[PDB]
Structures are given as C-alpha cells and as structure tokens.
Amino acid sequence: MENLIDFSGRDGLDRWLRATFPDVILSVGLTNYGSLMTSVPDLSHFEQMARQAKSEQEKDAVYSKALTEATRKAAPIAACALTSSKEMVKKGLQWFEDQIISEDGNFLVWHQNYEQLKKAPPSFEQLMGYQMSALNWRQSVGYGQLEETAVLVSQVIAQFSVPGTLVVTVQEMIKDMIARRGGGPKRGVSEEHVRCCVDIMNGNLSALINPAWGDIDKKNKNGLMLLTTGIAKLRELYGPAAMVKVQQAADKFGEWGKAQDVLDQSRVQEIHQVLLKSIAESTSFKNQIAQIDSVFSSYYWMWRAGITPESFPLLSDFLFELGQNARGSAKIIKTLDRIGLKWSKPLVNLFADSTFKMGRIHMHPAILTTGRLNEMGLCFGIIPASHPESAVNGSGFAKNILNVRTDGMNPSAQLIVQLFDIQRQSRTLSDLDVVSSEHLFHQILVGKRTAYQNAFQVKGNATDTKIVGFDPP
Numbered sequence: 143m144e145n146l147i148d149f150s151g152r153d154g155l156d157r158w159l160r161a162t163f164p165d166v167i168l169s170v171g172l173t174n175y176g177s178l179m180t181s182v183p184d185l186s187h188f189e190q191m192a193r194q195a196k197s198e199q200e201k202d203a204v205y206s207k208a209l210t211e212a213t214r215k216a217a218p219i220a221a222c223a224l225t226s227s228k229e230m231v232k233k234g235l236q237w238f239e240d241q242i243i244s245e246d247g248n249f250l251v252w253h254q255n256y257e258q259l260k261k262a263p264p265s266f267e268q269l270m271g272y273q274m275s276a277l278n279w280r281q282s283v284g285y286g287q288l289e290e291t292a293v294l295v296s297q298v299i300a301q302f303s304v305p306g307t308l309v310v311t312v313q314e315m316i317k318d319m320i321a322r323r324g325g326g327p328k329r330g331v332s333e334e335h336v337r338c339c340v341d342i343m344n345g346n347l348s349a350l351i352n353p354a355w356g357d358i359d360k361k362n363k364n365g366l367m368l369l370t371t372g373i374a375k376l377r378e379l380y381g382p383a384a385m386v387k388v389q390q391a392a393d394k395f396g397e398w399g400k401a402q403d404v405l406d407q408s409r410v411q412e413i414h415q416v417l418l419k420s421i422a423e424s425t426s427f428k429n430q431i432a433q434i435d436s437v438f439s440s441y442y443w444m445w446r447a448g449i450t451p452e453s454f455p456l457l458s459d460f461l462f463e464l465g466q467n468a469r470g471s472a473k474i475i476k477t478l479d480r481i482g483l484k485w486s487k488p489l490v491n492l493f494a495d496s497t498f499k500m501g502r503i504h505m506h507p508a509i510l511t512t513g514r515l516n517e518m519g520l521c522f523g524i525i526p527a528s529h530p531e532s533a534v535n536g537s538g539f540a541k542n543i544l545n546v547r548t549d550g551m552n553p554s555a556q557l558i559v560q561l562f563d564i565q566r567q568s569r570t571l572s573d574l575d576v577v578s579s580e581h582l583f584h585q586i587l588v589g590k591r592t593a594y595q596n597a598f599q600v601k602g603n604a605t606d607t608k609i610v611g612f613d614p615p
Contacts, residue, residue, distance in 0.1 A: 146528060147527050148229075152287065155224065172547055178219070178534065182557065185557075189563060198570065201572075205574070207468040209538065209561060219524070220288060222525050225285075225291070225437060225520075228451070230285070231451050235441070246275075251271040253508070260497040263506070264505075265356075266431075273435075275438070276438040276596055276598065280437075285437065291592070291594045293595070293599065294600055297601050301610050305551060312558075315562055315580055315583055319584055325504060326363065339372030339388075340376065345394060350391075359416045369417065370420045373424040392414070429598055433507065435596050436521065437520075440517050443510050444522070447492065453484065455528040456485075459528055465519050465523045469512075478490050489510075494509050513575050519537070544590045548586065558582060562583075587604035
C-alpha cells in the first residue's frame with residue numbers, strides 16, 4: 143500500500159508523531175530517546191525454559207522470545223520514523239543507483255564481490271570501502287538530522303558502572319567477548335592463515351600460488367597482510383627454526399619458477415617478491431572497521447532485494463510482524479517464500495546462513511543472514527509504514543536495547559546480563575552473531591546510544607573497559 147510516514151522538517155516530524163500516537167507520551171524514563179518503554183520487562187522465567195529446551199531450534203526460540211520481550215518497547219520512535227519516511231526511502235534507495243552509474247570504487251569493491259563474501263572473509267579494502275560508503279550515504283541523504291541518528295567521533299567507554307550484584311556476570315561477558323574476537327578467521331580451533339603458512343614452510347609451493355585465504359597479498363582487517371602476520375605467528379610458536387624453513391621455501395620457489403614453464407613469469411615475480419617482502423617485515427585501534435552500520439546495510443539489502451518506494455510498505459509490514467513474536471530462520475525462510483512479493487525471493491537469495499562456514503563475526507557487514515533481518519527490523523520494522531498507528535503495540539528487535547539507559551541503576555546492564563544467562567543456559571550451537579548478548583553489550587561499550595548511530599570513527603578497544611560496581615547508599 144502507501145507509506146503514511148510522511149513529513150517536512152523537524153517540526154513536521156513532531157506534528158506527525160502527535161497525530162499518529164495521540165494517546166501516548168514518548169518517554170525517556172528508561173531510554174536515551176523518546177520511547178514507549180514504561181517498565182523493565184521481567185525475563186527470568188525464560189531462564190527455566192532455556193534449560194529444558196531440547197532441539198537446536200527450540201533452544202533458539204527461547205532466547206529469541208526473551209529478546210523480543212526485553213526489547214518490545216525500547217525503540218526510539220522519532221529515529222524510526224525518520225529512517226522509514228517516504229522521503230528517506232526514496233533518497234536512500236536512489237543513492238545506490240548513483241554509485242552504480244558513477245562506478246564508485248569504494249562501493250564496488252565489496253558490492254560486486256557479494257557472492258565471494260558469502261563464503262570468504264573480506265579484505266581490508268573491502269571493509270574500508272564499505273565504511274566510507276556508509277558515511278557518504280549518510281551525508282548524501284542527510285540522515286544525521288537527529289542526535290539519535292548521528293555519526294559518532296569519540297573514544298570507546300573506559301569505565302562502565304553497574305549495580306554491584308551485576309559485576310561478576312558482566313566481567314565474564316567481557317571475557318567471553320574477548321575470546322570471541324581473538325581472531326582472525328578459524329575453520330577448526332586454529333587460525334587459517336597460520337596453518338597455510340606452515341603449509342608454505344614445508345615447501346608445498348602450491349600454498350603460495352593459491353593461499354587458503356585467497357590472494358597471496360591480501361590484507362587483514364587491520365591492514366596487515368595475512369602472509370606477514372602468518373610468518374610472525376610461526377616464528378613465535380615454532381621458534382626461529384621455523385623461519386629458516388620459510389626462507390628455504392622462498393628459495394625453492396624462486397628456483398622452481400625460473401625452471402618452470404607453466405605458471406606465468408610475471409606471477410612468479412609477484413609471488414616471490416611478496417613472499418620475500420613478508421619475510422622481511424615479519425619481524426615487527428584508530429577505528430571500528432568491522433562495525434555493522436545497521437541503517438546503511440539494511441538499505442543496501444533492500445536495494446539488492448529490488449525494493450522500490452512503491453513496494454517499501456509491504457516490507458515494512460513484514461518486518462513489523464517479525465517484531466511481534468519470536469523468530470526462526472526456518473519459519474522466516476518459509477514465510478518469505480510463501481508470500482510471493484517481487485522482493486521476497488531475491489531477499490532470501492541474499493542469505494548467507496549456509497555458505498559462510500567460518501565464525502559469522504568475520505563476515506563483511508554488508509552480508510545478510512536470516513539473523514541479520516533483526517538489523518532491518520530496526521530500520522523499517524518498528525513502525526509499519528502502511529498503518530503507522532499500530533506501533534503503539536511495540537516491536538522487538540535486539541538493538542532496541544541500545545536505546546535503554548545505562549545511567550541510574552543501569553536498566554540496560556540489568557537487561558543485558560539477564561539475556562546473557564538465558565543465552566548461556568540455552569546451550570545452543572548456533573552462531574547468534576548479531577543478536578547475541580555479548581555483541582549487544584559490545585555495541586553499548588563502543589558508545590552507541592541508539593542503533594541508528596554510526597560508530598565506525600570510534601577509537602579504542604571496547605573489551606578493554608573497566609567494570610565498576612556500585613552499592614546502595
């Protein structure tokens with residue numbers, strides 16, 4: 143149908159809010175920005191049904207029900223209206239057509255490798271390209287009209303204060319968090335670029351032509367070649383003996399290449415020089431490069447799924463219904479396949495759930511999964527565009543919790559540690575990724591005060607934070 147989220151100016155937005163939600167007063171009593179939240183939901187009855195879940199999916203279902211219940215009312219309404227207003231949609235979708243037409247390098251480096259990124263972790267350039275695109279998208283469409291909706295330029299949170307009773311769990315969340323992001327990409331227990339470098343150290347010049355990680359000179363998320371850091375890790379684990387064996391592989395390869403007639407002679411000098419370079423500099427957090435910009439990726443996704451300004455309201459409505467009850471990737475994928483809208487099947491085709499075998503935390507932020515539909519819900523699912531008055535019932539998506547206050551008694555931390563215990567007691571094997579309590583907490587520690595803020599330009603390491611307790615006076 144039609145998009146009834148329509149207004150001109152900041153004054154227009156406020157009048158739109160008054161008309162559409164006439165019998166409610168938006169409240170910051172528990173949130174950073176006006177919301178429907180009037181009480182901290184109770185969740186510890188979910189704790190018990192977590193223990194007695196049997197199958198994988200019913201484990202997921204219990205945590206998802208808790209997550210929905212906790213975040214049902216916390217969304218910052220004005221920010222949501224802005225994100226899915228008739229004018230924002232039109233401008234937001236249009237931006238991508240422009241990068242295509244202008245062949246924008248920063249946009250294309252990851253976009254037209256979408257297929258590869260469903261399987262492989264991204265390079266540095268592909269991460270930076272994305273992050274630069276998010277910032278430029280936000281500028282182009284004028285997204286930062288609200289404090290809720292801003293680009294952040296600051297430092298991660300150095301001290302996080304919680305009620306004394308929460309301190310223990312919060313600290314083990316930081317440990318858990320630290321252990322997850324101590325990457326990079328792992329197939330088994332070990333790091334892959336390392337095991338490929340051992341493969342190189344043993345001869346096996348084949349590991350040089352086609353590295354496990356892709357291109358020989360590929361740079362990791364911190365701008366360093368995998369081959370360089372790989373050779374570093376070897377000298378550390380398997381001592382300086384492992385380093386002489388690497389040089390032997392270098393020499394064996396150089397000798398092989400001149401004697402060989404098959405591989406191209408330019409590529410021989412590429413591999414050899416890059417390998418010698420890596421050996422050389424083997425002996426040796428300004429931003430958040432892997433940060434998902436929820437808003438920009440959600441817009442990329444619905445552009446990729448063929449959403450038009452016209453079709454947008456049915457998507458919004460679909461997401462709004464998702465937000466009403468627990469979700470399930472199996473049931474989601476059936477729902478999407480059995481409603482037959484033009485965008486339905488192209489959206490499903492984007493999912494990476496079955497193709498990304500590594501930890502999801504290593505996947506490029508522009509890559510969609512059934513899990514990452516909770517990102518789209520923040521943008522277009524809190525307010526159903528064709529019947530906006532229905533938002534008064536609320537709509538629960540994970541990162542709504544980013545809008546919950548961390549001051550006073552810290553309702554946010556209370557909600558977070560309750561979600562963390564439910565998730566831990568579900569004892570699930572699934573990669574909760576973008577709705578796991580530790581990912582959520584990490585967003586908070588980076589300093590996000592809603593989900594609509596971009597925190598790429600935030601300096602420092604969020605897991606370094608000091609957890610500080612306070613008691614009642």
